[PDB]
């Protein structure tokens, strides 16, 4: 059992090496900074087209269009300034639990219990949205997908693996295999040279899409990690888990900085997102409302409480003007 | 206050019309979540019905459109995607009667049935319970006592008694007997009787859901 115990003997020295860098806590550092005000966002828009629970949404890079997937078999693309439905794509499988909108805006992606990542072309010579590609390599439910560009996409799946595809050929050019539980969430770095994946083994892993290897593992949580998102700097990220706790990990420090939890919250987090400056952490809970946390002081800044069911998805625009919450009550709400 | 935004609004309203029509069409479907602890039994009932992830079988019985979702190809954590089937009309649970001597296997069937029946997502969704391989349990008990699975079972090992004991041992697993019903059928050789039983069980589930919708129950 030599090489079966050298593993935790390396784990002990990883812990001892990342404990020597813990000289002052993020609380001790950001103690003297002024707390944010009372973050009181009023709902500005309500999107009322979906007929079943909404499982995912994603903003466009123009901060106006947004795609949302619901288990009524629909993928609706909304113009959020006017609540106009730009598109309504009917999916081959109603069991969709993720969606992504390409940075160029030409393509959207969806996936779920069918084990397929469907890439839909929005801008065709005809007037309809066409199924551009179907990526069919995963053996477990596909829980997240994120476009790198028009040709590459990274998907996370319930077969405990992530994958980097190229859409033109339809094969996956890289597979990321470190997790031991279902990979539930995925976030791309701002430069798209790295990405974090949070799984059901209560861990997040930092992968690099070029060399296709795991660089760091973060193991602070106690239950399944459902959401993950980089800090806008790209040098940190935040995870939300089923243990009713969000928390911030730093890549360079290789450990945890802050824990965002309250006694009154005993419900898991379904979605996590950062403000444009990164000062506010938006966490969607399944106690029917979203919480706004002071990311630097762990103070609970505000509550967004307009939904009648679980808040399943959350996203802040690229210009930081608004935050869209999609819930299981079949409604999307824009807050500002 | 609108120049060609008017045409975009008209397109959005047409999309809304199409979405409403699709929703009304889908609300007439009967969705059945097909569960079990092995495809040996589940595979023989999809053949009874009219003709890689989730497998949807769409068929029509007596001008009723059933969509039956078999999810046994998902070797993932069930708790992470089972809530997708919260609004399913019914659950068709298939257990084999002949796995009371195999490996312990009947006890795993019970574990799965108890985990599914007592979810927080299936508090109202009733269960159609199929006891498959009626003809193998028929002649197994002559040469294999039932007590290998049920040490506390005191009774003759005749089919009519030993099968009813299993049926009660399964119907005594739901902790909520006032919100859902378990419809139990002993899967028979005949082609049409199983789908007739499913049709009858779905008719009750629809009647009891309508009584709740109309505020009478």
């Amino acid at each position, epitope marked *: 059992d030599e090489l079966r115990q050298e593993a935790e003997q390396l784990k002990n020295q990883i812990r001892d090496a990342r404990k020597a860098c813990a000289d002052a806590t993020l609380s001790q550092i950001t103690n003297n900074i002024d707390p944010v005000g009372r973050i009181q966002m009023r709902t500005r828009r309500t999107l009322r087209g979906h007929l079943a629970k909404i499982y995912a949404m994603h903003w466009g890079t123009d901060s*106006r269009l947004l795609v949302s997937a619901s288990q009524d078999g629909k993928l609706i693309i909304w113009d959020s300034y006017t609540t106009n439905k730009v598109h309504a794509i009917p999916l081959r499988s109603s069991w969709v639990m993720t969606c992504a909108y390409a940075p160029s805006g030409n393509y959207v992606a969806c996936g779920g219990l069918d084990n397929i990542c469907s890439i839909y072309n929005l801008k065709t010579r005809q007037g309809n949205v066409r199924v551009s590609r179907e990526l069919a390599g995963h053996t477990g439910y596909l829980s997240c997908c994120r476009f790198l560009d028009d040709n590459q996409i990274v998907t996370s799946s319930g077969d405990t693996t992530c994958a980097l595809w190229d859409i033109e050929t339809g094969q996956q050019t890289t597979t990321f295999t470190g997790h031991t539980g279902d990979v539930m969430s995925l976030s791309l770095a701002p430069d798209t040279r790295l990405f974090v994946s949070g799984a059901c083994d209560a861990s997040a892993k930092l992968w690099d899409v070029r060399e296709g290897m795991c660089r760091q593992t973060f193991t602070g949580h106690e239950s399944d990690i459902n959401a993950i998102c980089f800090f806008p700097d790209g040098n940190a990220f935040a995870t939300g888990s089923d243990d009713a706790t969000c928390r911030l990990f730093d890549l360079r420090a290789d450990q945890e900085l802050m824990t965002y939890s309250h006694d009154n919250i005993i419900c898991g987090i379904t979605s996590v997102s950062f403000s444009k400056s990164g000062r506010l952490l938006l966490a969607g809970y399944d106690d029917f409302n979203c919480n706004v946390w002071d990311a630097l002081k762990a103070d609970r800044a505000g509550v967004l409480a307009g939904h009648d069911n679980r808040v399943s998805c959350l996203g802040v625009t690229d210009d930081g003007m608004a935050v869209a919450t999609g819930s299981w009550d079949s409604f999307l709400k824009i807050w500002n | 206050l609108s120049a060609e935004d008017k045409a975009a609004v008209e397109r959005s309203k047409m999309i809304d019309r199409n979405l409403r029509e699709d929703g009304e069409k889908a609300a007439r479907e009967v969705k059945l979540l097909l569960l079990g602890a092995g495809e040996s039994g589940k595979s023989t009932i999809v053949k009874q019905m009219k003709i890689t992830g989730i497998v949807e079988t769409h068929f029509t019985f007596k001008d009723l459109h059933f969509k039956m979702f078999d999810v046994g190809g998902q070797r993932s954590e069930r708790k992470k995607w089972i809530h997708c089937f919260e609004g399913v009309t019914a659950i068709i649970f298939c257990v084999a009667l002949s796995d009371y001597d195999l490996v312990n296997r009947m006890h795993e069937s019970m574990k799965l049935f108890d985990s599914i029946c007592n979810n927080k997502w299936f508090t109202d969704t009733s269960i159609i319970l199929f006891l498959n391989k009626k003809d193998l349990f028929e002649e197994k008990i002559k040469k294999s006592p039932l007590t290998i699975c049920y040490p506390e079972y005191a009774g003759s090992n005749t089919y009519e008694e030993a099968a009813a004991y299993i049926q009660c041992q399964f119907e005594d697993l739901n902790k909520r007997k006032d919100t859902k019903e378990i419809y139990t059928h002993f899967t028979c050789a005949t082609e049409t009787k199983n789908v007739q039983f499913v049709f009858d069980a779905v008719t009750d589930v629809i009647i009891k859901n309508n009584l709740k919708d109309c505020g009478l129950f």
Partner: single-chain antibody
Amino acid sequence: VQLVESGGGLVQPGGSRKLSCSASGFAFSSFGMHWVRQAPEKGLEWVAYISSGSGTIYYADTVKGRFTISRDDPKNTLFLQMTSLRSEDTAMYYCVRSIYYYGSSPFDFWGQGTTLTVSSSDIVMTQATSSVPVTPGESVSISCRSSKSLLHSNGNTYLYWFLQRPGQSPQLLIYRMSNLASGVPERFSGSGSGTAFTLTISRLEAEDVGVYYCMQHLEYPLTFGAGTKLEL
């Protein structure tokens, strides 16, 4: 994508005709459709419009009452029934597809046109020039001027630039005053503010020669500029 127009021909002044437009290669049901005439040796004149789903219909005041535009989606046909034809309805009629959503490119495809020969508060878009001589390689600017300001409160200016090459149907170059249509080379650039607009060709080729039309889509009836032609 393809639109084929049929039905035109020699008519007596007072008679009636039925022009048809068979669509092919695109989702005809999702596209609003326009009839746009062009009189012999004159410029484009918008005739009629029927929306997707036939829920909205507009006519030019010179054809309101006489012409009726209809649409039968399952066989993908657009109809213009023209009654009480008079000697100045003689023209070539183009069938134009036009889709309207956020970021869409309306007026993107034009049919080949069918010739009709009837025998014997609007926004005024002004193209001050009528014809300019060009040499391949050099840049050129075409100026359009509107009576009302085409800039709207929602931020986008509704100016469209089309090019009609000799012997061909018009081709959309620029939509909403600054956006290049798909398939248009990047030599063309549209600028302007409110009432004065410019189209710039960075370097002329043998395939940029033709008549350039500016159109307003701020409000109906859609009006065109007189058209100024590049020529070698």
